[PDB]
Subunit: 358 residues, 2 copies
């Protein structure tokens, strides 16, 4: 019974591919900042909140599925949506939040505090705080710079320490003081470069799929990860200018340790890829995708690995993470990238627990 | 009931943003080819079939909404999905068709003949047949080349006469004999270049939205249609290589008359754009988007035109159409593009009526 003995709050991550409810217990320090944060309940549902029809009945069914069986009810709730809602204009988002408001009113258990769409810059800030909280690097001044990448379905975030730079948009910088230390971060979010959204530009690229994979417009896969990666790079850099925006800031503000969350954790953890110590390199990721998926015969590979719904996309995703990290951000292909094990349930929502007290 | 005296079939265009049921009555000529095709019923619903969750209740609700009030039944039904379903792997699509098949087997007003996702090349063939059926150019050999463009939510098609060519993929060429004439067409569909998918790459481009439009990541619009157009061109050409694929073939097989269907018809017929004779030029489209939407103050313009859900996108759409047609396909900016009025309910489904028999 942790909430009779500690502060508890519920935070919902309403992401593009699904929603995750977390209930956290915590204590606070002499400034009322959260410490000893523990997840006491987790429930994840699909699909994305923004993908459902915005009406009375659909929203009731969704929230009921997300929330009903939660072992404790009478606590404060934060519902924060990310890139799936950001694909919609505010006028269309309002329908969702109007219905969501009404639902929390028909019940007297949950105490809805806020429900809104957060910007990609806020999501990146919470990404950094959540990871660094878990690493225990917040309470003392660090010798080393820790960067975080979050690989989502409709957006990707990157976030790292950088002193205030009045040449760069205020939207891409954040200054916080936490646990008595002053931290300055660069934040950026690329909407359209998440997994789902970017995949929709390459479904008819034979280099991006296993041999003989049936592409939608009737051609056959003929995988080749270096080729697929160059196609993805054109979207990263010719369209979004990822390189031009990010590389000069990392040159001048190098990151010593990189951590990633989001889909890359699942792929790295899957039966198809082999990585030690919950870390990878981009070079090993591209070579493994090239040999274990791109250059395999699809029907054979599909039969060997029956229980993985993302299997058909692994040539593409391997290629895409390499294009993003190496050709986009400029990270060296042999640089270690730590990824958080998916079983740990780490998303940015611990960031909300902390930042609201700051 | 016309179907007691004429052949009737139902064809459903299951597109990315909605499904449209059409019931056609027709007679046949001496070769059993349809003539005198008349739409006797139309019903359109949203959202797209691929956007719903696939289970018994949801598909029943969707199919009931689409079909249940048709004045005529006891007829064959063809359900053909397009790019919305093409975004999904066959394993996910299969769930939708298994539930759809069951729904039809559980009733007796409709005789399902086929329910399947068609390729964008099939969709392009049907786009050309539907338009030329309505122009009455199919019964006699033409001394004018007619090209057809279909602007969808997830793909765009282009299709035009081109003699059979051993160097072009067979998948991009179609030969058919109709009404005693032999017609060879080049077909192409670009998955990811439809309006909805494209627009997801540019939601944070200030050049693509009216002044001060709130972009999702917190920057402000600062519209400029030529600048937006150049951004969209990088998707067209640096990613999809539209120019390299299409321009050489139009150079060798010039089109005399261009017809467009899909979203452009709605935009051009809206209260914000002014065109006569159901035709436009790319030069005028880009000018009108630039001056009438891009360079306006968002809140002022939104207050002036409350009744149009697409208004916020019109700076981006005018620029995207120009990027697609001018920079992608090579069409001269002063060349007339005819658009079928939206009231006419012309989509490619008339092609299905004709094509079966050939
Ligand atoms: Mg996420
Ligand atoms: Mg369509
Ligand atoms: Na997309």
């Amino acid at each position: 019974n942790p909430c009779e003995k500690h502060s508890c709050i519920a935070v919902i991550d309403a992401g593009s591919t699904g929603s995750r409810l977390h209930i956290y217990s915590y204590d606070t320090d002499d400034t009322n900042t959260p410490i000893h944060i523990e997840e006491i309940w987790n429930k994840k549902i699909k699909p994305g909140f923004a993908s459902i029809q915005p009406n009375s009945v659909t929203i009731d069914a969704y929230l009921t599925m997300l929330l009903a069986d939660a072992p404790i009810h009478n606590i404060p709730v934060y519902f924060y949506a990310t890139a799936g809602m950001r694909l919609l204009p505010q006028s269309q988002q309002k329908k969702y939040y109007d219905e969501l408001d009404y639902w929390f009113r028909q019940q007297s258990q949950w105490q809805l505090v806020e429900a809104k769409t957060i910007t990609g810059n806020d999501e990146a800030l919470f990404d950094w705080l959540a990871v660094n909280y878990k690493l225990d690097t917040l309470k003392s001044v660090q010798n080393k710079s820790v960067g975080v990448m979050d690989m989502g379905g409709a957006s990707v975030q990157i976030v790292f320490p950088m002193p205030k730079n009045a040449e760069i948009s205020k939207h891409n910088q954040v200054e916080l003081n936490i646990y008595g230390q002053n931290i300055n971060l660069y934040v950026h979010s690329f909407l359209g470069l998440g997994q789902t959204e970017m995949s929709h530009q390459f479904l008819n690229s034979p280099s991006c799929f296993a041999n003989d994979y049936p592409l939608p417009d009737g051609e056959s896969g003929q995988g080749n990860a270096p080729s697929c990666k160059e196609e993805v790079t054109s979207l990263m850099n010719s369209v979004h200018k990822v390189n031009q925006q990010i590389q000069p800031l990392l040159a001048l503000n190098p990151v010593n340790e990189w951590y990633s969350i989001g889909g890359i954790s699942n792929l790295a953890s899957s039966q198809l890829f082999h990585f030690e110590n919950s870390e990878l390199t981009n070079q090993s990721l591209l070579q493994q995708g090239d040999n274990q998926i791109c250059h395999q015969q699809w029907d054979i590979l599909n039969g060997q690995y029956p229980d993985d719904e993302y299997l058909y996309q692994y040539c593409l995703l391997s290629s895409y993470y390499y294009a993003l990290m190496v050709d986009g951000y400029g990270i060296n292909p042999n640089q270690t990238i730590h990824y958080i094990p998916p079983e740990q349930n780490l998303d940015w929502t611990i960031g909300v627990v902390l930042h609201r007290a700051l």
